[PDB]
Amino acid sequence: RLEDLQEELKKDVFIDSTKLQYEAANNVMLYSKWLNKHSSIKKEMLRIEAQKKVALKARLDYYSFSMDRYAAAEMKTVLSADKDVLKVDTSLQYWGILLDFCSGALDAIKSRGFAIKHIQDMRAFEA
Amino acid sequence: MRLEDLQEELKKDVFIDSTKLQYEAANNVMLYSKWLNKHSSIKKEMLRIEAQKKVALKARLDYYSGRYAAAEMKTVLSADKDVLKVDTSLQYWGILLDFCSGALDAIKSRGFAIKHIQDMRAFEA
Amino acid sequence: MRLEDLQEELKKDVFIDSTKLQYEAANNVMLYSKWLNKHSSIKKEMLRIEAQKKVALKARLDYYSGRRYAAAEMKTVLSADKDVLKVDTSLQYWGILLDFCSGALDAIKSRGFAIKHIQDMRAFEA
Amino acid sequence: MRLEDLQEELKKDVFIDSTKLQYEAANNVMLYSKWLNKHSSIKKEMLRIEAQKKVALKARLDYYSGRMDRYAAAEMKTVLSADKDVLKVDTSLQYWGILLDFCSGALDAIKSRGFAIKHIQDMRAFEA
Amino acid sequence: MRLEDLQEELKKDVFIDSTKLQYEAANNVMLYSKWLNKHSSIKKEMLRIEAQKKVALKARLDYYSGRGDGDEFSMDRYAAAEMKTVLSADKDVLKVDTSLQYWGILLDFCSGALDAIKSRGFAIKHIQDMRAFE
Amino acid sequence: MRLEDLQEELKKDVFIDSTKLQYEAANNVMLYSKWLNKHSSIKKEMLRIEAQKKVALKARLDYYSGSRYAAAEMKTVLSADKDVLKVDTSLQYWGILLDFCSGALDAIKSRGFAIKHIQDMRAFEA
Amino acid sequence: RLEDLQEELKKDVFIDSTKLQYEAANNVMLYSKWLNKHSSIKKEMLRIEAQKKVALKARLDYYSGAAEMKTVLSADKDVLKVDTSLQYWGILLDFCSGALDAIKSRGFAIKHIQDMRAFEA
Numbered sequence: 001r002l003e004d005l006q007e008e009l010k011k012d013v014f015i016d017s018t019k020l021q022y023e024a025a026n027n028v029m030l031y032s033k034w035l036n037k038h039s040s041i042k043k044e045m046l047r048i049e050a051q052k053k054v055a056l057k058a059r060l061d062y063y064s065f066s067m068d069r070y071a072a073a074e075m076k077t078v079l080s081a082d083k084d085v086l087k088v089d090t091s092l093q094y095w096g097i098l099l100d101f102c103s104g105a106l107d108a109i110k111s112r113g114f115a116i117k118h119i120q121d122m123r124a125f126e127a
Numbered sequence: 128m129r130l131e132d133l134q135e136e137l138k139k140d141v142f143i144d145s146t147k148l149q150y151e152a153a154n155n156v157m158l159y160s161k162w163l164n165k166h167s168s169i170k171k172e173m174l175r176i177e178a179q180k181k182v183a184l185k186a187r188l189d190y191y192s193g194r195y196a197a198a199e200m201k202t203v204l205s206a207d208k209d210v211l212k213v214d215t216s217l218q219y220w221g222i223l224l225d226f227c228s229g230a231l232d233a234i235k236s237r238g239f240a241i242k243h244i245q246d247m248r249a250f251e252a
Numbered sequence: 253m254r255l256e257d258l259q260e261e262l263k264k265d266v267f268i269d270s271t272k273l274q275y276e277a278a279n280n281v282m283l284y285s286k287w288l289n290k291h292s293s294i295k296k297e298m299l300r301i302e303a304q305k306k307v308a309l310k311a312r313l314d315y316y317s318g319r320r321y322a323a324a325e326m327k328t329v330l331s332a333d334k335d336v337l338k339v340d341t342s343l344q345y346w347g348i349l350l351d352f353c354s355g356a357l358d359a360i361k362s363r364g365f366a367i368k369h370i371q372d373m374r375a376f377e378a
Numbered sequence: 379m380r381l382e383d384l385q386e387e388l389k390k391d392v393f394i395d396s397t398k399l400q401y402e403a404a405n406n407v408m409l410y411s412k413w414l415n416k417h418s419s420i421k422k423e424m425l426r427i428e429a430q431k432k433v434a435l436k437a438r439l440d441y442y443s444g445r446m447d448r449y450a451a452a453e454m455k456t457v458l459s460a461d462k463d464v465l466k467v468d469t470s471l472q473y474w475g476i477l478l479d480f481c482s483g484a485l486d487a488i489k490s491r492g493f494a495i496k497h498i499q500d501m502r503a504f505e506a
Numbered sequence: 507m508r509l510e511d512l513q514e515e516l517k518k519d520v521f522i523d524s525t526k527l528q529y530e531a532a533n534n535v536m537l538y539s540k541w542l543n544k545h546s547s548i549k550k551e552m553l554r555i556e557a558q559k560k561v562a563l564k565a566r567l568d569y570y571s572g573r574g575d576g577d578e579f580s581m582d583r584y585a586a587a588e589m590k591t592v593l594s595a596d597k598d599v600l601k602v603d604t605s606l607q608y609w610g611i612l613l614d615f616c617s618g619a620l621d622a623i624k625s626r627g628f629a630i631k632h633i634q635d636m637r638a639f640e
Numbered sequence: 641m642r643l644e645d646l647q648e649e650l651k652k653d654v655f656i657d658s659t660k661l662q663y664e665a666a667n668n669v670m671l672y673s674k675w676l677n678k679h680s681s682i683k684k685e686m687l688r689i690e691a692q693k694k695v696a697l698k699a700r701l702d703y704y705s706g707s708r709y710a711a712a713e714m715k716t717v718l719s720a721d722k723d724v725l726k727v728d729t730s731l732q733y734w735g736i737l738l739d740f741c742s743g744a745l746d747a748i749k750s751r752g753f754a755i756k757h758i759q760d761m762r763a764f765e766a
Numbered sequence: 767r768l769e770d771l772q773e774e775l776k777k778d779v780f781i782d783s784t785k786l787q788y789e790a791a792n793n794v795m796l797y798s799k800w801l802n803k804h805s806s807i808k809k810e811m812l813r814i815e816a817q818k819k820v821a822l823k824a825r826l827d828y829y830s831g832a833a834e835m836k837t838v839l840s841a842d843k844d845v846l847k848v849d850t851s852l853q854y855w856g857i858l859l860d861f862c863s864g865a866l867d868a869i870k871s872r873g874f875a876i877k878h879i880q881d882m883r884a885f886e887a
Contacts, residue, residue: 167352
């Protein structure tokens with residue numbers, strides 16, 4: 001669910017100032033974590049994307065004598081590759097939204113790491 | 128190669144030993160090297176498979192052209208079993224390569240984080 | 253040249269001799285030079301091969317144009333051409349080498365920074 | 379000019395005389411100038427050749443456009459790319475482009491050699 | 507202005523008189539100014555020429571499009587991609603563009619120059635410190 | 641405003657009175673303010689003029705879309721438009737002033753550093 | 767108003783040498799003051815920027831009933847007004863960035879002058 005990722009990133013970006021020191025190392029770990037999410041979403045999408053391509057050919061074959069005789073009307077009833085591919089594709093757009101969220105997450109962590117260094121510096125400035 | 132295994136490897140790599148910050152700085156540059164090497168080898172493989180794919184594409188094009196609508200050829204072939212398989216492979220490596228690019232970004236910023244932490248320590252002094 | 257051998261060379265190069273952190277600092281700039289030279293020479297080679305490819309392409313265009321391929325297919329088929337595929341494969345390979353060398357130069361520049369950082373942590377230890 | 383000779387020149391230039399770390403520091407800025415000068419002049423040459431190429435392209439375009447052999451226009455783009463006179467001039471231009479990229483690298487190199495120099499000076503200050 | 511002459515000027519400028527390391531430090535900032543001034547004036551000129559170039563391009567487009575350039579007309583009918591090529595070949599346009607690009611080269615040289623003066627200033631401080639070390 | 645006059649003013653500003661190295665340090669920060677002020681006001685003006693230009697562009701676009709201007713070429717012809725060319729020339733000119741002022745702020749910051757360095761050479765002769 | 771920020775910074779950067787001591791502490795307070803200005807300005811611009819996106823979408827609809835769509839919409843009086851505002855705040859923000867740079871280095875100049883005093887001793 002997207003909301004759960006929103007809540008997760010939200011929780012993650014907050015900084016504990018005394019372990020501002022701890023947080024610097026931990027900052028790189030968030031990057032890793034979200035990178036992993038990123039790749040897995042892409043991986044999933046690729047598989048589903050692959051599936052859609054095959055479904056299209058099958059439906060294409062359906063829709064467009066001498067040679068075997070396949071019953072066109074039962075082909076139509078049984079195959080429903082339109083309904084099914086389209087359904088799965090709707091799902092795929094959902095994942096596209098997730099992937100866009102993960103991109104936002106990495107931009108966020110990179111700049112959080114900078115903000116962290118900045119605050120450390122403004123403190124050193126107060127000194 | 129498996130993407131999950133690269134994920135776990137990067138995971139291991141990004142961890143920082145606070146007591147060995149100096150070591151980690153040098154090893155950080157070594158990590159940069161390691162992932163750069165992974166990167167180049169993955170792209171190399173993908174390039175080879177890409178050549179194979181260009182050939183599969185030509186062969187299937189021949190099949191479909193009768194050597195059926197001209198326009199449908201693009202769709203069907205894009206969907207061609209053999210082509211779909213080789214293309215799937217190629218795209219998979221493309222995903223690995225993108226992961227390695229992310230990895231190099233990660234190591235570069237880990238190196239910066241390292242400098243930052245050193246600074247917060249000298250500040251504590 | 254082999255990409256793997258450049259990988260091993262860079263691998264060797266990035267290793268740091270801590271007592272000759274001092275030596276390495278000067279030696280670090282020399283590494284930059286070495287890889288920059290490699291870098292340029294690779295592009296140079298690729299440019300020559302690229303020129304050859306352009307001629308091959310014209311020949312294949314002639315081949316395909318009949319001087320029964322479809323014009324869009326002309327693009328596809330020619331891209332698939334054995335000879336063109338071979339020369340292009342080579343050219344792209346060199347492109348990979350070039351990208352590796354770009355990575356190498358980034359690597360040495362930051363190794364130089366890491367070196368200064370370590371020097372500083374030492375003076376801190378003092 | 380030859381690329382390898384620039385490679386050797388940069389090679390010689392980047393070497394550091396540690397006692398004349400002091401001399402080298404001043405000389406370091408002079409190196410920047412020298413390569414900067416090389417840099418602008420190569421681009422200048424390339425610019426002239428680039429103009430020539432554009433004219434050659436039009437000329438070859440005319441040849442190819444029928445204004446000997448009859449090439450389809452998208453294919454005209456391909457064939458003209460094959461243009462021996464054009465190919466020669468472009469190849470040349472790109473060669474200078476290679477030189478230019480090398481000089482950009484060189485200036486980056488001198489900038490950081492200057493930093494390395496300060497670093498070494500600091501390790502010297504460290505032995506104290 | 508000539509690029510080679512700017513090369514010689516910068517060459518002269520970057521040289522350091524060590525006893526007047528003191529003089530040079532102040533003079534170093536003055537050099538920045540001098541080249542900054544050069545810099546801006548060069549860009550200014552190029553901008554004027556750039557405006558001129560834009561007009562030439564429209565005129566040549568008309569020429570090439572069969573729309574005429576004064577009492578002169580291009581009996582040729584150019585394809586738009588070819589329009590791009592042919593106009594790129596435009597002798598008058600090529601001349602003005604060549605000029606403009608030349609000034610662009612001068613400008614890039616001046617940017618390098620300002621970088622140079624900035625780092626000469628740094629080298630100066632560093633050297634002062636190495637002097638104090640002895 | 642004229643660019644040359646800014647060149648002369650900056651020229652005057654960057655000069656250092658060594659005995660009032662003390663005075664100059666404080667005045668150096670005041671210079672920053674002055675040029676920062678110049679800087680912001682110039683961009684503000686250019687922004688207003690930029691708005692005017694955007695309107696001019698639309699007007700000329702209308703003119704050109706039906707003035708017989710070709711649809712693909714519109715960018716070129718308009719780029720050459722008398723009114724547009726005038727307003728754009730102005731705007732770019734102010735852009736030149738802005739870039740000069742940025743250089744100026746860089747200059748004052750480093751003049752401040754040079755000042756600290758010289759003070760140090762004085763503590764140094766002792 | 768930008769001019770008023772110019773006058774405020776102008777007042778801020780002037781240095782009282784005897785209260786070089788006072789000024790050092792007051793210097794950090796200035797940093798704070800302008801940092802707060804800075805953040806609040808970005809926040810406002812961000813809010814206005816959101817509004818602009820909606821205005822843009824509305825105007826896009828208007829215009830769609832494509833490249834010229836981009837040109838004309840850029841010319842979009844309502845969009846032009848909101849963008850003008852947004853850019854204005856961007857100018858203020860850049861000014862405040864300059865201001866923070868100014869206070870940081872004024873702080874350095876103060877330490878330096880303190881040192882020349884230490885020099886006569």
